[PDB]
């Protein structure tokens, strides 16, 4: 019931709807409200609600309530501090230390492992959809573009995932894609946190692909069996050599470079799963450092 909530401010717009900051007048709890105005109830909302009600994990945003009225639909979330995009925009150059990055990636992999173990593909992992609190936590948010997948997968919606974070199997138009697409996105985010700029900031599909190829090499049959038969593969693709990861992400240690490499593997089934990534030596000394407080 909307009576108990006092809206504080608008935060922005997600995959769908508009997000507000609000306060429960009775408990004092600060909450995020995701409003949707009512073709009936949107697919995006139906999916987000159903899946987010199933998913209870420390690194997935907590959906507290669904306020279901005649003309308006409100999703009530726990309020944390800030999304990661804003955090990075607010951070000074030296403002995001490696231990925090390592902690954040470890946690994001936990949240994602949980999603995938519960047959959910997120399909829009980017800084804006990741939320941090003041105590060192980070959580997956905005499941509007998510879906429940089957075993084995069917063909699902094409051209999914925000362009900069979109996996090469989506770009090359493969009939099937699955959990590997979210890992690719996280790898791009990992590199972005370290270097403080987007890894592959393409403006179109071909630009996106060519940017990926210049970093990882142009894929051939050896690195990616079946690649030359993929619908949007072109034999005219320029050939670029793969570069050293010491040069792709210079501040990163040997273990970090190893993990990033496995997250950005061309072949989706050779690409590391979130579950397997949790045991990577990169996390041997992982802690939970606290971020700065600047908004």
């Amino acid at each position: 019931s909307m009576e108990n909530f006092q809206k504080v401010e608008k935060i922005g717009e997600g995959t769908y709807g508009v997000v507000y900051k609000a306060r429960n007048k009775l408990t004092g709890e600060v909450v995020a409200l995701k409003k949707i105005r009512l073709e009936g109830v949107p697919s995006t909302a139906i999916r987000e609600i159903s899946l987010l009600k199933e998913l209870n994990h420390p690194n997935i945003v907590k959906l507290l309530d669904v306020i279901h009225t005649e003309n308006k639909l409100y999703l009530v979330f726990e309020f944390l501090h800030q999304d990661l995009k804003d955090f990075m925009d607010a951070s000074a150059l030296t403002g995001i230390p490696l231990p925090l990055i390592k902690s954040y990636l470890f946690q994001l992999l936990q949240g994602l492992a949980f999603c995938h173990s519960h047959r959910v593909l997120h399909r829009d992992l980017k800084p804006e959809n990741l939320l941090i609190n003041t105590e060192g936590a980070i959580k997956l948010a905005d499941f509007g573009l998510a879906r429940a997948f089957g075993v084995p997968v069917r063909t699902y919606t094409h051209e999914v995932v925000t362009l900069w974070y979109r996996a090469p199997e989506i770009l090359l138009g493969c009939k099937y894609y699955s959990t590997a697409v979210d890992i690719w996105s996280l790898g791009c985010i990992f590199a972005e946190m370290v270097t403080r700029r987007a890894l592959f900031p393409g403006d179109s599909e071909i630009d996106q692909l060519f940017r990926i190829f210049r970093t990882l090499g142009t894929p051939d049959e050896v690195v990616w069996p079946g690649v030359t038969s993929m619908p949007d593969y072109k034999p005219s693709f320029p050939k670029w050599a793969r570069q050293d990861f010491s040069k792709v992400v210079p501040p990163l240690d040997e273990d970090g470079r190893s993990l990033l490499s496995q997250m950005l593997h061309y072949d989706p089934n050779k690409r590391i799963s979130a579950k397997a990534a949790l045991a990577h030596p990169f996390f041997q000394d992982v802690t939970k450092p606290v971020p700065h407080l600047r908004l």
């Binding site: 073709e39 009936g40 109830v41 949107p42 697919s43 139906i46 999916r47 609600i49 159903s50 899946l51 009600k53 199933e54 669904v66 279901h68 995938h116 173990s117 519960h118 047959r119 429940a148 089957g150 075993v151 084995p152 069917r154 063909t155 699902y156 919606t157 699955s178 959990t179 089934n269 799963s273 579950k275 397997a276």
Partner: protein, 258 residues
């Protein structure tokens, strides 16, 4: 076989129990019957065929309806409205390109208005508490298909056919979990086409033995034998198509030797 196949199977087994409709709800329904439900589900099959919807969407709609009717009394003149709203919701959940609301209004022969469909959608959502990601017979089947030695298209389509037939008849299939119906349908399809039986690898994955599936299997064998004589025929018509390898034209076995 991903790193998550076991986790997902385990999770779907948990959720099928939580998503299970009330076995004896039709007795508590003052106006509708199993026959009326059979007519509805057969009609949903036609709708799925007309709009080329996923079988999964069909299975989801039926789950929503049965759960809705588990707590909500519905007059016979309103059953199709419940069914339409459920198919719409299943379509929004499962389909890349759901048919539009106006298209759902059209195939209800203008019995209902757009506003009615939309209001029924809201009510279904309220009653199901937005919990739409339910396990289905189809979801278990596609997992079981990975255990074929080797893969057989005719077996796959026959299993899906058999599992689809079970949707029509609340008596007796309401008492069986999706994972069990899928096991029965996979064994029955495997037996009809190849002569082989419920495989050891699935026995160990599911914990289900031939014996444990026998009750459901006996019912399904009977539905299969009696299928040509059933009042509702849309599923047999559907599974004649080359898309499903014309498996409904295949002969059911005389005995299962159980």
């Amino acid at each position: 076989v991903p790193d998550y196949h076991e986790d997902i199977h385990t999770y779907l087994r948990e959720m099928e129990v939580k998503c299970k409709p009330k076995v004896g709800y039709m007795k508590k329904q003052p106006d509708i019957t199993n026959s009326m439900r059979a007519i509805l589900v057969d009609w949903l099959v036609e709708v799925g065929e007309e709009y080329k919807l996923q079988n999964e969407t069909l299975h989801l709609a039926v789950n929503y309806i049965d759960r809705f009717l588990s707590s909500m009394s519905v007059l016979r003149g309103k059953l199709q409205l419940v069914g339409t709203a459920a198919m719409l919701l299943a379509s929004k959940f499962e389909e890349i390109y759901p048919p539009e609301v106006a298209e759902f209004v059209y195939i209800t022969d203008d019995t209902y208005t757009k506003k009615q469909v939309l209001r029924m959608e809201h009510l279904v959502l309220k009653v199901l508490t937005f919990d739409l990601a339910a396990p289905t017979v189809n979801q278990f089947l596609t997992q079981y298909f990975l255990h074929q030695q080797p893969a057989n298209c005719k077996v796959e389509s026959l299993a899906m056919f058999l599992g689809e037939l079970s949707l029509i008849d609340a008596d007796p299939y309401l008492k069986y979990l999706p994972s069990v119906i899928a096991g029965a349908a996979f064994h029955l399809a495997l037996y009809t086409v190849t002569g082989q039986s419920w495989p050891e690898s699935l026995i160990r994955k599911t914990g289900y033995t031939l014996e444990s599936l026998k009750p459901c299997l006996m019912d399904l064998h009977q539905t299969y034998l009696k299928a040509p004589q059933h009042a509702q025929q849309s599923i047999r018509e559907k599974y004649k198509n080359s898309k499903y390898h014309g498996v409904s034209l295949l002969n059911p076995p005389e005995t299962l030797n159980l």
